[PDB]
């Protein structure tokens, strides 16, 4: 009963809050999808376009265009794959890596401002909540 | 330490929303198209210009999203951003149903995960859900 309502409310809250945090790309010529691909590439390291498409759950034609756009802006490099495949490996450039870190700082600074409008008790609840939510994604199959 | 609360909470919400996103049923819409559709369904009819502002995408990108959604029959029309500037776009019945279907999939998966926690932990998440909505000024 209130089980259903907690799943509804918590899902809503995390989607709505994350929506705002995704919007914390400092203005920049990269889209939401481009930044997401870049972030994955930066955090997980060099990979092929096919693997990246899979990691993002986007189909290869769409991801190949994202990659091309990121490369054009110099945010991702391309190198031939060692071991003749013959695939390409894509990785973040230093401007790409810096962009991902800049975006993360931006989310953090934005969030801190919002959290400051709450009292200490509320922030304490969100601390426990943050730990639990992190555990939930860790523990998911 | 409130510094680390901004860091951890952001990380948690980015990762969890990522998992919930992945539970959206397979569909012919991209993430950006779904977002526009969802906004349109939950907040109501708007002009293409208003939808673009709401989605924080540049008007040319939004015109193609709107056009694509009309093509798929998920919105009633796709007015030209100049010639139709003052025309309202709304979700169709199939579009609204897509949005509701996605919403159910996310919450049902989440309910399964929440069931692995104890009552005290769920109490915390219950309070946190309200607080997080308040953070984005989206309280009732």
From Swiss-Prot, chain A:
Function: Part of a regulatory network that coordinates tolerance to the antitubercular drug bedaquiline.
Disruption phenotype: Knockout mutant is hypersensitive to bedaquiline. Deletion of the gene does not affect sensitivity to capreomycin, pretomanid and rifampicin.
SMART domains, per the entry: HTH_MARR
Domain of life: Bacteria
Name listed for the protein in its UniProt record: HTH-type transcriptional regulator Rv0880
DNA-binding segment(s): 49-72
Gene3D superfamilies reported in the protein's UniProt record: Winged helix-like DNA-binding domain superfamily/Winged helix DNA-binding domain
Quaternary state and interactors: Homodimer.
UniProt remark on domains: Contains a winged helix-turn-helix domain connected to an alpha-helical dimerization domain.
Domain HTH marR-type: 3-135
MF annotations from Gene Ontology: DNA binding; DNA-binding transcription factor activity
One Pfam family recorded for the sequence: MarR
Record keywords, A-Z: Antibiotic resistance, DNA-binding, Transcription, Transcription regulation
GO terms for biological process, alphabetical: response to antibiotic
Disulfide bonds, paired cysteine numbers: none
UniProt keyword Transcription regulation, yes or no: yes
């Amino acid at each position: 009963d209130s089980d259903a309502r907690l799943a509804s409310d918590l899902s809503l809250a995390v989607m709505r809050l994350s929506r705002q945090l995704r919007f914390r790309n400092p203005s920049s010529p990269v889209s939401l999808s481009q930044l997401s691909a870049l972030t994955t590439l930066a955090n997980e390291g060099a990979m092929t376009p096919g693997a990246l498409a899979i990691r993002e759950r986007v189909r290869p034609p769409s991801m190949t265009r994202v990659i091309a756009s990121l490369a054009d802006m110099g945010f991702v490099d391309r190198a031939p794959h060692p071991i003749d495949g013959r695939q390409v490996l894509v990785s973040v450039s230093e401007s790409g890596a810096e962009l991902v870190k800049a975006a993360r700082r931006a989310r953090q600074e934005w969030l801190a401002e919002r959290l400051a409008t709450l009292n200490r008790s509320e922030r304490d609840i969100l601390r426990s909540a943050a730990d639990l939510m992190l555990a939930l994604v860790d523990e998911s199959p």
